[PDB]
Subunit: 184 residues, 6 copies
């Protein structure tokens, strides 16, 4: 048997506090309850929908970055520790897919990744010098790609950044980035 409405809702607040980015689908699977029930529950709880929460959190992050302007950034910058790590979320719309197939275009995922690497480095001048990438799974129209970047090495002239991207906890894309920086 299932939780009483009240306890389901308490549990839903705890989940979202704990993961500000948890989806309604994830919440429905967790509590084994229709995706519509999740919506009514959030409404009752005064928790805004995922898009909004995502946009609220990201807005604060563009203040921490200096290499690229907010409106140039690809995706939503959900997390950033300058010079250490960062994450973005990007929805795949028809602009981003091949028209015959609905398969996401490679350069879109590369763009999300490259942008994130530029953004996480706290320098005036930050350019990508080299990159090698692997497209591990097809990404489809309407997917949401979470990219996660981290610095793996830092020399005097470069940062080496690894990016891994996911669609529902499935690794879809991996890349290595060699980033140049100077005090200018």
């Amino acid at each position: 048997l299932k939780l009483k409405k009240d306890k389901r809702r308490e549990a839903i607040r705890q989940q979202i506090d704990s993961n500000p980015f948890i989806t309604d689908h994830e919440l429905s699977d967790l509590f084994q309850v229709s995706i519509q029930t999740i919506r009514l529950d959030r409404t009752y709880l005064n928790i805004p929908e995922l898009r909004k929460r995502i946009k609220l959190v990201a807005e604060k992050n563009y203040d921490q970055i200096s290499s690229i302007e907010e409106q140039e950034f690809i995706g939503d910058l959900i997390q950033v520790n300058p010079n250490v790590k960062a994450q973005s979320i990007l929805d795949i719309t028809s602009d981003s897919v091949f028209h015959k197939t609905g398969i996401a275009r490679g350069h879109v995922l590369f763009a999300q990744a490259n942008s994130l690497c530029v953004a996480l480095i706290k320098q005036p001048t930050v350019l990508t010098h080299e990159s090698s990438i692997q497209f591990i799974e097809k990404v489809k129209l309407n997917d949401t790609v979470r990219a996660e970047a981290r610095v793996v090495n830092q020399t005097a002239k470069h940062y080496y950044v690894e990016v891994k991207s996911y669609v529902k906890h499935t690794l879809v894309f991996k890349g290595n980035f060699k980033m140049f920086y100077d005090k200018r």
Copy 2:
């Protein structure tokens, strides 16, 4: 001393017949004559401007390709030998540059290259699986990037394609692409 008007113009026709894509700047340097003189000369000769000639030639090429639709293609497909080699030209407009610097965004050059590799392979299904790329020189607002792709290996399941890109005969970008294909 310089060529008489008549002989300069004869020589200009021969050059363009010989390179349909030669620029007015290249023609001015060749004959050491203002870029405006080149224009008057072409007008007299009934040779259309570079943009037009480029668009006339490319139009015929989209007929030879099957992996990607014409209007999805990045740049102008100036040359194509299906399954062997191909070339595109792409102008760098403000859409393609970082706003602070006028430096072309990495994903734009990668997009030109990735598109070209997809286009040159004559299969129904063609996906990029892996890529490694080097950004050799900064590309600037208003540059024109010529990308040149060639197949270097072909196995039963993949084509390996090398792309090299230029701005006025200067190598600016290099990439290796691992492309998947099947009969579907």
Copy 3:
């Protein structure tokens, strides 16, 4: 009395197999059941909504045509027998109506029809030479117009094509088209 849920759903699959383009409204009228019930039923059946099915089928058709490029085509090409007959579907949006009245603009329906005639003829060069048309009923904002073209005569230099267009099986527009063609 009405069909049990199970039998209604079986019957709904049979209908859609039989007419890939049947609407939810048509399905609701058939089974005398709310338009929302139809939606839940399709969801259960794993049958995508009308827009999608329409776009899946049409995508395959642009491969058969050569006179006009896919992205220039007006409406969705749902059916094509080159040089014989063809059909398109076109939604009437605010772009297509007079602003004071919501009445569809004449040139929009003519455009759907003219495009279809160009598309169905399998020649490199296909131009419309003459046309006579009758606007039989007002088409309104949000209507969907199904145009149906067929060749009625073929001489050495022309095809004569008749187009008839409908909104819910009501004839709204009729046209005769005199089409030129050559091997060029």
Copy 4:
């Protein structure tokens, strides 16, 4: 020999007073003088370029019409005698041509014509009921099409309007329009 600068310029003012829509090319042919000389002459004379003059005159005309809103009108309404005759000018841009050929799309010329017929009739409700049209010459990218409409018959319920369209005094398109009207 040619006219002195002064007399050429006097003659140019007289021409434009006499035809507010005469082009610089027409003026150059008339006086056998480069198209650039015509420009310098107009500048000296304080006569604005063709586009402007066209837009100044047309602006006054939308006040006389009631069947269609100004911003819905196709082309520039250069002349109007409500219920009798009217004319528009329309530039053919890339939006209006087939992409492979630069040939103007049929529905564009039909749209100019149909709009003009709706505009010239001074009634609240004016709908096109029937039309037959002939595409007499190919219209190309960058052409300017002058459409000329006149009422040929008027019954109690309809106006019969003939439209003829030109590119440099060459008849390119002809149409007959059966227009419905009522007091509503």
Copy 5:
């Protein structure tokens, strides 16, 4: 206890007849019944949604005004007594808000107000000469602002117009406008 369905619906028709612009939220508060119940009720009653009714009424009003063109008007002109008073409604979309905060930009509310003052004056030439304005409350993304303009003085050369703007009967913006007019 609450009204029977039938009587609620009768009462809802009377309300909308009486205020063509009453919202579903207002109707839900009145009858203490979910906003969704209001929707089902209107559907049953054949009363179109607020957006439509608003657009139907406003369409008739642009005929009465002469100083500014319909498509230039900011908001929907719901009410107009030329030279006396007028009202508009304007939705606040992301175009109209600061990006960090969702707060409506001042010039948007000023634009609604200034447009309304120009529109209500029945003269060929009508220009704003002076204005003083007070932003009384923050307007937020997705609010709907009702602006209400009235002439308070009229001299030989000017009209003095007061505008007051509201979001759910809360005064949010107030302005005084000094408007110039002549017979030209």
Copy 6:
């Protein structure tokens, strides 16, 4: 008589060093020499055109401001002393004028002014509370409006800012702004 080419050009560099925003028209009037001569001179001198220089200088200024995002700013921020004074330049395009007349819309000039006041104040939260404005001269299509803002009073809760706007050193618009600020 006029300056030798060499001395004219020396003098032109000195002028632009001295006023980075001086126009070619201003330079032509100064040296009484065609606007085209000015262009050739700048080309020779390696001084970029006005648009570019303006965009280079402004780019550096958005770094100093915190109340409004760069891409939301109306016009180009050519000068800024946070909490003291600032200036913008704004071109008047067809988007900004009444369609019948080419006269700039009031809210456009108010927008330039209001944006500048928000931008110059170095606080997280900065809102306009009150404003009174005078439209002193008609601004026309293609004019360039220079707005100049300065703080005239500062209390604990507000800044009082005066804006004056010009087209070729002619005062066209004046405004007083009451701005709210807090540490949030």
